[PDB]
Design a protein around this ligand. Sequence first.
Ligand SMILES: [Mg+2]
Ligand SMILES: [Zn+2]
Ligand SMILES: [Zn+2]
Ligand SMILES: [Zn+2]
Lengths: 92, 185, 120, 55, 528, 58
Amino acid sequence: RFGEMERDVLVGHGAAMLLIERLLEESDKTEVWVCENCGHIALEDKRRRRVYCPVCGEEERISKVEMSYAFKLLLDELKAMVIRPKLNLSER
Amino acid sequence: MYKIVTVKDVVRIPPTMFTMDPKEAAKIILRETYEGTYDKDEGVILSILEVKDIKDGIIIPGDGATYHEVVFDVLVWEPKIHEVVEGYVADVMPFGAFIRIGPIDGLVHISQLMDDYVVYDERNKQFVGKEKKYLLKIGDLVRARIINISAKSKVIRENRIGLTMRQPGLGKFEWIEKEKKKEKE
Amino acid sequence: MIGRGKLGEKYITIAEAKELLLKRREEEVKAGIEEPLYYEARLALEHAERFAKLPADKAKEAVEELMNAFEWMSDRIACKIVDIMPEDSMDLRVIFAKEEYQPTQEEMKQILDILDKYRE
Amino acid sequence: FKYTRFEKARIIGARALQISMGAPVLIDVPPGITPLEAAILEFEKGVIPITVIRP
Amino acid sequence: MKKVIGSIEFGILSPQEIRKMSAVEVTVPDTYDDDGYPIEGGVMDKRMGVIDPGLRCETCGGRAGECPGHFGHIELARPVIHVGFAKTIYRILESTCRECGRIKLTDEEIEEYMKKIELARNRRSEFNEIIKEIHKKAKERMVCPHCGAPQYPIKFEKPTIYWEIRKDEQGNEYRHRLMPTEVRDWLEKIPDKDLPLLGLDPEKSRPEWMVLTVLPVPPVTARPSITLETGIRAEDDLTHKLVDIIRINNRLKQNIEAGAPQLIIEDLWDLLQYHVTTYINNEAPGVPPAKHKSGRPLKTLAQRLKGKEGRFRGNLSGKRVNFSARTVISPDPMISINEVGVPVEVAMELTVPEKVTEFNIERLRKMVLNGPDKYPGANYVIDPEGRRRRIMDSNKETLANQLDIGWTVERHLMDGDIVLFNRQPSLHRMSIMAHRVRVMPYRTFRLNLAVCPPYNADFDGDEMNLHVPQTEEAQAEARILMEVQNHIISPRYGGPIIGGIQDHISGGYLLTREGAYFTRDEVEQMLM
Amino acid sequence: KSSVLARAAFEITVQHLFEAAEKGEVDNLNGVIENVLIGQPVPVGTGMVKLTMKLPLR
Ligand SMILES: [Mg+2]
Ligand SMILES: [Zn+2]
Ligand SMILES: [Zn+2]
Ligand SMILES: [Zn+2]
């Protein structure tokens, strides 16, 4: 039903949250902890209920970023090969 | 051991608390969030004392609450290795005794009680020495020195702190006198 | 690590903590909650009461005079001094045992002097 | 200063979300209306707490 | 507490990062095991994450479905050339001295090229052209300007074989194969200052890291075992390739530690290189495609990405979105231009979630009392905790007396709700607009006639779609940004696009025609 | 197109990824396709504004 022309139209109207609501919807986006120092996916251990970046120190001001599941698997594939996808979180 | 630390953080204030002044709202949120837990790097979080400064909130799309950056100070009890501490005995096991050093109770292993053969008599809830029949009963004020701190979980009770007594110049308040009694000469 | 970053810290003695926990429990009882403090806070307050010492004001005076009259000791050793409250030379040895520095007899003589200046 | 229509849309959305979540309404409203027209009336009366930050 | 990714910078991983980022050192080529349990030191360890049900992750402690997975690393015995960077490595070798490793270029040329690169940074095509020009200039040179040592020509053999054409004491040209260790040694000596001219960044991509020393292992979620209809745990092609990699690596290591001859070490080295290349890309040029257990080429990391239906080019698509409807349209001028008529049956399915507050509690109470059959009713009610329940008739009488602030009711569509309206093919901006609902009988999307031009619609069987936004932000955006009122003037030519079409013109002419008069009855009737 | 993610869903090979990684290319996420794929608000229109509020309310 939806498609690319409709996406272009919604962009042309300037509506962005409408695009997120209509396309992404729910149960396909997830929460991922990201380190703000190096730019790697931080690890949260529920036994210790702590977040630590096992690259450049544990509590490097780790923040939380929501992303779609497909993008998470894409990042995993990119990291599987040598390419390193550093993420720079933008200040709100 | 006691300390006051100033910390900057970000606090989420739900819309239900918008009608109240931000300072006490963030204070209540911090009370509910931080008190009652142990910090691996700062010790036991005692209680939030006062919020110094608050910034204006930022609204996250998809969330009705507002997030503010606040500066506040908190009471902590942070012990360190090789630190003497005054405390009173609270409980005794076959393998040693709790020593109430504040928010948590230290334990002295039975083999490191004192420099002599020691037997345990749970009937009086105390251990028995030999050279002057040293008694380690409940309520005794000891000059115990900390030698081991095991920070494993953020739960206060789970973490263990190993503190010894056998090192020279150390004794309970009763044997502190007896220490000087042999030092009277 | 507590919070997102530590900006500063200062060491306090047993007396100021007694005062702060007293204010906490009084605010709670005026807030309608009968329970003064939680389990660990109750333990800490009970230990502080059982090992009470000089009131807060004279404790602050003692530690500030300790910094004025004794430099290389930081606030932590000052609050240790006013908490354990050494009444003798041997107490000051056992307090200052594992520390890297060791004082000369005159030094602990004057620290004992300041202690008597506040030992009521 | 004049509100661009994108800014007005975002302000209305945020205010409606807050009202739905449980925030009090700053003005009296007719009964049986959704949060959205409540926020729209709030904006029309000019009573808006939210403000925009421009670079 | 929720931030937004502002930028993504790409680079080349360093072996130290791969070592510390990973958790478990995979050493044993172990499968799912007979009892379907993760074998220690296997490809699917518990530190890699768990996808099998009824067990906990070793690293994060998460059950399958909540553990995101974790990375593991393989310690290679010998350096292996990455297939993707092979051409880059060959280009670099032709541009650097064999002894010093610096760029074979004069300082003035370096300055000029650095200025040009600084100017043309952003333009990717011009940057590539400058890089190619510098590469040609350096490769054409023979004597290093810094050392003066000869630079024997380097010949590249696809896919990952490099030959150094050296001259013997008799002048004959013989091909000397460059082992990956030699290439690494050559690459390490390159200074940082020469990287920008060489086409590299000395903070995220260093030439030594192109040759792989540690091979990371994707988590189990990234290589799941989809199982089979027979219950056989149909493995992942990546899993099989990793098993072969582990086997060959252990074999090469044990023969190395056993003082084996150089020939067998070379054989195992080349087997490892071929397996690594086919694992990264099973369709790399000059590489025989590895066959599955059924004899088909295995889908590998390269094939998992360059797919039209994969992560790239596949996530963007058009599928059946939720809360939508489609039916034919019929005209009616009795509604306002910013209104749409919705059939009752559609309105009883496309529910919208509304949170109950103090000023709308009674309306929602009546609606939930109506049930899912009366038109002003509801289909689902969500408690403040989060469970969802169907109203039905058994508990219709309750769920209303126990409904207070904090609940969520999925009521039916009612008059005044905002709704999008679309017509395909969607050419310009005005093909999607927001309308106000007006529920009427029968089954057609009633549309005012003045709104036909922007939609380019005729009532001869044309169909339209409507979507119902759910969240408050989307509803506000539709109401403020997308309403029909704001789009009277067309963005194309700056004139109106909404207006009369056929009767609105002819009847207007009849009304205003010279010599046309109306009686009192007609005047009052038409005005009303 | 500078955005390697945007170019990625327009091609048939993967060498562009390796070239971008070698060059240390930084994707600014300033476009539309990349943000849509990630699942983030597009930086156009209402995706551009930022909001702040003074909490004490009547
Ligand atoms: Mg037609
Ligand atoms: Zn990091
Ligand atoms: Zn896990
Ligand atoms: Zn050279």
